[PDB]
Design a protein around this ligand. Structure first.
Ligand code: SF4
Ligand code: SF4
Ligand code: SF4
Lengths: 356, 160, 167, 110, 155, 75, 146
């Protein structure tokens, strides 16, 4: 039972974490995940900062998809103050949020395919960041979410590049879909892990790909009527093969479902930039409001107890992947050191929203 | 016939290696783009351009900042509402370039540029002055090593 | 208020020795090869630009360093002790970054932890900024003539036992 | 794990079996490594004064459990003592390293 | 609420605090009968617990570790949310953990003990999940001072 | 609408703030016991914070702290 | 490359203000700085990418102004000068001069570069080692445009 140190510079690059295991032989049997490495103290500083000052702070959580964090932390005060967002800016927010979900799943499967290369996905990623530069102007550090919608307007080149992104992107996606059917090393090196079912993934804490891996059509934005999700084409992954390749088909189907949503929303266009802007500064109320949104990892959440002041009295975040990190102590029991790379890939986690 | 099943697994494996080898050989044909060193739009939010006489009052850069870094000393001059502003000290090691007061300025003398070459040898050098923050960075068309960056187009294949 | 160096002479003042020093310094300024050290928001520049933690002396700290990160970081600098230095490529390796006021478990720069040559603007710049940073560092090492191989150990210690109370 | 220290600039706890500069294995022998980066002058008599002051501070500040919080407190006020010693001119700077950042501020004309 | 007058009305203290902002409901529950209350709300239809919230109103006084338990599932989508309000004080940090039945509460209760210091039982490994094990004091409570540590200042 | 003003020195005794953790580090020591903390905001409770130490602020009761004087200290 | 001649040292001891026209092609710039350092001199660094009012920074004890993060006061203290304290940063007597290595030719203002070159003529032990806007070769043109 030689204790692994599981150091800060991992052989893989998926964050800094601590997974000391007794490993009797090569079989890992007992996990003790030590965290606190990439920690900032978001809650106390968010109690010490306003919404327009913790609004630059929402970038250090799920920075592979930064639209979700600022999206839920601006959708908090919109439903809190009951201020209506017009349909145009809300649908463009839906388009860019699904594009960030696309970016999150491809930036998962990039380094996951690198561990188990970079320019096989970067040919797409250069045009993806060109879309981010034509949408807001930054690469992943955007500050463009207001109460009335997008802080700016879409330029006349970004809608043309958004029309071109579908037949720029879906063809290389379906050229990348056949690899797992062709290449048997993904049928023999990541096949098998992920043995949890649906009645158990509901039982512990799970959401996102680990909950849709068992063949459950789970969606917050389908159950909760949000952003007119029943107008668009939906196909939530009811893939019941359980394992890690079931999760890969889950993520391919989620990317293709977002492609279908954006492709139906290419020519929608139902309406200004910011509705209800009389003054630059405002405040918040005091309610008992827990707002959540469909994360790419499953139910990102914002807890809020107001102060009727410039600062929020309570600001607690429920990150999706940190609740999804609880299941590995149970998914460690009968695997190998060559398996834990596939495990910490298939969790689909970065340490930005973990410690926070 | 278990070794026959091993052979059939390796036949499917060789078919997949050949198909993925064709895919990667086609992936090696990414010749026109090739991003590297030189040897964007207006919202780059890089180096922040600052103007001194247009900066007058309200001290909103020290307030909306997530860390409150700006240090400007000021002494009121009588009956003319002049604050006598001096030493617009910005530490870019403290600065995030997250851009709140760039668009939240009442004067709007705070504007962003495309400069990002501020990698320096000392932290005390990063404390910049108001005249150092009023310098036009670069006209990137006018270099003998920088061509036109593919801003509006993509995969041009025109250099060759 | 500073100290005084020795500054006697330059003993290696032949043409062959200064030629070998210039060539070894320019080749030392040519072969960066970092051990990457990402695992933060500055890891994103690695895909656009080893594993033995005693090998690569020319590492740049491209990560958000905290107080719990600090013992492993000074141990890793003990694993790169004599030849080369580190480059701060984050506002949090310089001033603590955006949390420079109120963060308890984050050090206000590694400028109180490790010798730093070059300070960056910090939050992920363009991928040619690291190229300009290693070019500057190459100009810095080109100024260095390997200090004419001039060496001193302090060795401050008490052999009296502390008033200990372990668990 | 095995490293139990609060190591900063000019203050390193290093409670290990370190008589010479060869590290090991770990014990109650706190080996105060000072100035790793060659930042100041650090004359030997002044180093003996600072080491004796640190010995008196760890003698009078013990009695409680010598866990990591006492290590943070003792390294922190040791750095305060080094700062107030260099501000009074007992510790000059170095200008022999490749940085010389003047970590405690430039001495004024006052 | 629904379960406070139907299931917890048969001899349990479901002390309601009204409705919350959107659809949630806050019901005050004491710290002695909490694990049986957790099992009773578990066998009701509610299975999915997330976002244990440890808010620190009235520093030096009342301390709370509320829940956001709901009843989402695979095929059905009856999302009935509720806040199980458990309360404590500074003098009494003793609270029962749900880690005996709901084992996935390791990180949640460890962060609650790590940021407030709420003393727990029936828990397999209650350690400081973000701070060192030598660390005394708790930062999230509003009556806390970060002591004289040089790494907290720039200088 | 509040108890005191904003910007007065805060003196702290170890017995006067016995609800907090002021007796764990018996002896190291601390620094906010003397007239070092300044009142930055008030509500029953008042925000505090040192004039030179840049660390995170806190919240303390209006009787648990004490408005000492107007004497800032730096360098 | 590697043209073996110390004519740049003759330029720095004759004119002492030369624009170092040299690319970003690695460290082919500090070798003459290393030859000045091996001659017994001392060389320190500066950059004009964020240096404003250069004569008011090299002399006249420009202010410190510590950046408080919304907690400390203004504390308008006077930091020591750049090159006067650098002349005060020569403890032995064998140091013949002080080289001021400047590595930013852009955002420099031609007038202020002439003002900084005249400040290299102010002290006799000051050497200006400014950049030359990154030519392809290694060219050491003097301060003629400035
Ligand atoms: S620049 Fe902005 S913050 Fe400064 S005085 Fe003018 S309006 Fe106020
Ligand atoms: S540039 Fe960004 S960090 Fe700096 S003061 Fe303006 S908003 Fe704050
Ligand atoms: S300064 Fe900001 S972006 Fe850079 S490493 Fe630190 S936290 Fe990340």
């Amino acid at each position: 039972l030689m204790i692994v140190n599981m150091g800060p510079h991992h052989p893989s690059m998926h964050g800094v974490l601590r997974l000391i295991v007794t490993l009797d032989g090569e079989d890992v049997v007992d996990c003790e995940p030590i965290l606190g490495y990439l920690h900032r103290g978001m809650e106390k500083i968010a109690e010490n900062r306003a919404i327009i000052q913790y609004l630059p702070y929402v970038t250090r959580w799920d920075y592979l998809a930064t639209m979700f964090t600022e999206a839920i932390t601006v959708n908090g005060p919109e439903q809190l103050g009951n201020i209506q967002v017009p349909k145009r800016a809300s649908y463009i927010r839906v388009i860019m949020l699904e594009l960030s979900r696309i970016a999150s799943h491809l930036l998962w499967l990039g380094p996951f395919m690198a561990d188990i290369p970079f320019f096989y996905i970067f040919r797409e990623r250069e045009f993806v960041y060109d879309l981010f530069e034509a949408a807001t102007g930054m690469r992943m550090m955007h500050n463009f979410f207001r109460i009335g919608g997008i802080a700016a307007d879409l330029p006349y080149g970004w809608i043309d590049k958004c029309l071109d992104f579908c037949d720029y992107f879906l063809t290389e996606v379906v050229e990348y879909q056949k690899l797992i059917t062709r290449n048997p090393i993904f049928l023999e090196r990541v096949e098998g892990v992920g043995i949890i079912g649906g009645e158990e993934a509901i039982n512990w804490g799970l959401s996102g790909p680990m909950l849709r891996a068992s063949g459950i059509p789970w969606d917050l934005r389908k159950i909760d009527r949000y952003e007119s999700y029943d107008e668009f084409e939906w196909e939530i992954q009811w893939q019941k093969q359980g394992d890690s390749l079931a999760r890969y088909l889950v993520r391919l189907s989620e990317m293709t479902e977002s492609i279908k949503i954006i492709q139906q929303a290419l020519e929608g266009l139902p309406y200004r930039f910011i509705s209800k802007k009389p003054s630059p500064t405002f405040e918040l109320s005091k309610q008992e409001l827990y707002v959540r949104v469909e994360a790419p990892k499953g139910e990102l959440g914002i807890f809020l107890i107001g102060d009727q002041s410039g600062f929020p009295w309570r600001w607690k975040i429920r990150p999706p992947g940190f609740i999804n990190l609880q299941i590995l102590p149970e998914l460690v029991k009968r695997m190998k050191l060559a398996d834990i790379m596939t495990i910490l890939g298939s969790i689909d986690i970065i340490m930005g929203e973990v410690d926070r | 016939t278990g070794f026959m099943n091993y052979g059939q697994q390796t036949l499917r494996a060789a078919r997949y290696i050949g198909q993925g080898f064709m895919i990667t050989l086609s992936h090696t044909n990414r010749l026109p783009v090739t991003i590297q060193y030189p040897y964007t739009s207006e919202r780059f939010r890089g180096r922040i351009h600052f103007e001194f006489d247009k900066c007058i009052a309200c001290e909103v850069c020290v307030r909306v900042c997530p860390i409150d870094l700006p240090v400007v000393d000021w002494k009121l001059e009588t009956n003319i509402r002049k604050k006598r502003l001096l030493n617009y000290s910005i530490d870019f090691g403290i600065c995030i370039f997250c851009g709140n007061c760039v668009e939240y300025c009442p004067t709007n003398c705070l504007s962003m540029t495309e400069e990002y070459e501020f990698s320096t040898y000392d932290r005390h050098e990063l404390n910049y002055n108001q005249i150092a923050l009023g310098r036009l960075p670069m006209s990137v068309i006018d270099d003998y090593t920088i061509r036109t960056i593919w801003n509006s187009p993509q995969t041009k294949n025109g250099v060759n | 208020s500073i100290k005084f160096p020795i500054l006697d002479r330059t003993t290696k003042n032949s043409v062959i020795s200064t030629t070998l020093n210039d060539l070894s310094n320019w080749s030392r300024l040519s072969s960066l090869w970092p051990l990457l050290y990402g695992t933060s928001c500055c890891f994103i520049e690695f895909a656009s630009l080893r594993s033995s933690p005693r090998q690569a002396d020319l590492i740049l700290t491209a990560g958000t360093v905290t107080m719990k990160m600090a013992p492993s970081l000074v141990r890793l600098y003990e694993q790169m002790p004599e030849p080369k230095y580190v480059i701060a490529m984050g506002a949090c390796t310089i001033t603590g970054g955006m949390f420079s006021t109120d963060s308890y478990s984050t050090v206000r720069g590694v400028d109180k932890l490790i010798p730093v040559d070059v300070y960056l603007p910090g939050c992920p710049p363009k991928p040619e900024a690291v190229i300009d940073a290693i070019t500057k560092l190459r100009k810095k090492i080109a100024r260095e003539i390997y200090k004419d191989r001039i060496r001193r150990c302090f060795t401050t210690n008490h052999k009296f036992f502390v008033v200990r109370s372990p668990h | 794990g095995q490293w139990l220290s609060s190591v900063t600039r000019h203050v390193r706890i290093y409670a290990a079996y370190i008589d010479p500069e060869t590290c090991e294995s770990q014990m109650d022998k706190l080996t105060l490594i000072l100035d790793p980066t060659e930042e100041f002058v650090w004359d030997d008599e002044s180093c003996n004064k600072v080491y004796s002051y640190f010995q008196e501070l760890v003698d009078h500040y013990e009695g409680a459990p010598l866990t990591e919080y006492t290590l943070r407190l003792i390294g922190s006020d040791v750095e305060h003592y080094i700062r107030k010693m260099l501000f009074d001119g007992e510790i000059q700077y170095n200008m022999d390293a490749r940085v010389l950042n003047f970590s405690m501020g430039k001495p004024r004309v006052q | 609420g629904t379960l406070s007058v139907w299931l917890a009305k048969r001899g349990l203290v479901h002390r309601s605090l009204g409705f919350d902002y959107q659809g949630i409901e806050t019901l005050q529950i004491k710290p002695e009968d909490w694990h049986s209350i957790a099992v009773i709300l578990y066998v009701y239809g509610y299975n999915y617990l997330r976002s244990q919230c440890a808010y620190d109103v009235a520093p030096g006084g009342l301390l709370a570790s509320v829940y956001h338990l709901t009843r989402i599932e695979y095929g059905v989508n009856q999302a009935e949310e509720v806040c199980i309000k458990v309360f404590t004080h500074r003098s009494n940090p003793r609270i029962p953990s749900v880690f005996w039945v709901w084992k996935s509460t390791d990180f949640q209760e460890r962060e609650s003990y790590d940021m407030l210091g709420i003393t727990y039982d029936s828990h397999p490994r209650l350690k400081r999940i973000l701070m060192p094990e030598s660390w005394i004091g708790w930062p999230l409570r509003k009556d806390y001072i970060a002591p004289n540590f040089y790494e907290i200042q720039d200088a | 609408v509040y108890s005191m003003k904003k910007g007065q020195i805060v003196r702290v005794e170890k017995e006067k703030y016995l609800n907090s953790i002021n007796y764990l580090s018996v002896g190291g020591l601390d620094y906010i016991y003397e007239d070092r903390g300044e009142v930055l905001d008030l509500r029953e409770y008042a925000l505090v914070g040192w004039v030179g130490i840049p660390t995170a602020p806190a919240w303390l009761p209006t009787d648990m702290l004490i408005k000492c004087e107007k004497l800032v200290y730096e360098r | 490359v590697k043209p073996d001649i110390g004519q740049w040292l003759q330029d720095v001891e004759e004119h002492k203000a030369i624009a170092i026209y040299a690319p970003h092609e690695g460290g082919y710039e500090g070798r003459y700085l290393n030859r000045l350092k091996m001659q017994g001199y001392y060389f320190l660094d500066i950059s004009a990418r964020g240096l404003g009012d250069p004569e008011t920074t090299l002399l006249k004890n420009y202010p410190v102004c510590p950046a408080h993060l919304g907690k400390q006061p203004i504390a308008r203290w006077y930091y020591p000068p750049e090159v006067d304290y650098r002349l005060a940063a020569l403890p032995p007597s064998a140091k013949g001069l002080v080289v001021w290595v400047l590595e930013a030719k852009v955002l420099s203002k031609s007038e202020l570069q002439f003002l900084a070159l005249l400040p290299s003529l102010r002290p006799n032990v000051r050497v200006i080692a400014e950049c030359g806007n990154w030519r392809k070769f290694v060219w050491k043109p003097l301060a003629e445009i400035a």
